[PDB]
Every structure is written in C-alpha cells, then in structure tokens.
Amino acid sequence: MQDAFTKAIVAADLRGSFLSEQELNQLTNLVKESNKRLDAVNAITGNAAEIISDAAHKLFAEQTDLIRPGGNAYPNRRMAACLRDMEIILRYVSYALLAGDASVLEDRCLNGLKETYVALGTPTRSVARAVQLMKETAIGYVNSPSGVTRGDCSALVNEAATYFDKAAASIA
C-alpha cells in the first residue's frame, strides 16, 4: 500500500531527483513524533470493543427505527452486519493513523462503500452518523490517557479526526 514515507519517495521519483533537504526535514520530524503517534494508536486498539459498543448504543437510541421491524438494523442477522461494519471502518482508521496516510483507508475500505450501501438500501446517512459517534468516543481515549508521559498530542488528534471525516464523507 502506501504511507507517509513511501509517498514522499514516489513524488521525488517522478521529478527524477534525490530527496530535497526540505522534504527530509518533514520525515525527520515525523520520526520524532513516533512515540506519541504510537501511543495514540495503542489507545484506540486498547479500547476498541468499548468505542464501538458505546457508539452503537447511542446510534440506536437516536435512530430507533433502524431496530424496528422494517428498519435496516433488524433483524439480528442485519444488526450483526451493522456492528461488524462499524468495527471494520475503525480498524482501517487506526491503520491509517499509524501509516500517517489516508490511502490504506481509502483504498481497502472506503472505495465503493457508498454504492454498496446504496444498492442494499442501507441509509448512508446513518452509517456516516455512526462513524462520527465513534470518532468522538475514540478521541476521548486518545486524548485522556493515564501513565503516559504528559504532553501535547493535538497534532495527532487532528489528523485522527481527518481520517474519521474522510470516512464519514465518502460513505455519506
């Protein structure tokens, strides 16, 4: 697939050139943040189950019809799928977060998802909603850990957001 480093390379390649010193300095600093970056990911993965569980509860409290006969989350079989999907999206997002690049997320998850949902009659809107619900919960953890060295994660936090949002948008 692709990630921050690989990407920069590829660009450089088409110019046909060695990497610009400026460009190195992007990567140099990217490295420095690693530790933070990692912990962020670790936080998501550690809380995964919960993040979802949570988001779901809220999703269904809001859109009660999804779980009523005739809705899209009914019956059990469907419900199951809906949960599974949420999770997947999450999984990918995390991947991206580590890579430092949207691609992986876009290519092996988001691309064509909308259309699928459409064909099935799944309401894309609601899906998107779920993704956001997840987002907020997730950030919650990323941003409030215990026993990690205290410092500023904002930079990472925002990038996380963006990933979630790309998801929300392309599904929606």
């Binding site: 697939m1 692709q2 990630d3 480093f5 690989t6 390379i9 990692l38 990911v41 670790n42 998501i44 993965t45 995964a48 999984r91 995390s94 991947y95 580590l98 890579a99 992986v104 092996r108």
Partner: peptide, 25 residues
C-alpha cells in the same frame, strides 16, 4: 511497497485484526 510499517499493516489487515502490541513493537 515493502517497508516495515506497510508490512505490519498488511499482515494486520489480512487477518482482519486491530494492530496489537506485536506489530507496534
């Protein structure tokens, strides 16, 4: 393209599993 980072993602992705401690190490 094979780098350390891409691979672990790939492996994680194939199994369908979150990145756990193994990969981060």
């Amino acid at each position: 393209m094979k780098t350390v980072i891409t691979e672990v993602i790939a492996s994680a992705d194939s199994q369908g599993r979150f990145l756990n401690n193994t990969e981060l190490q």
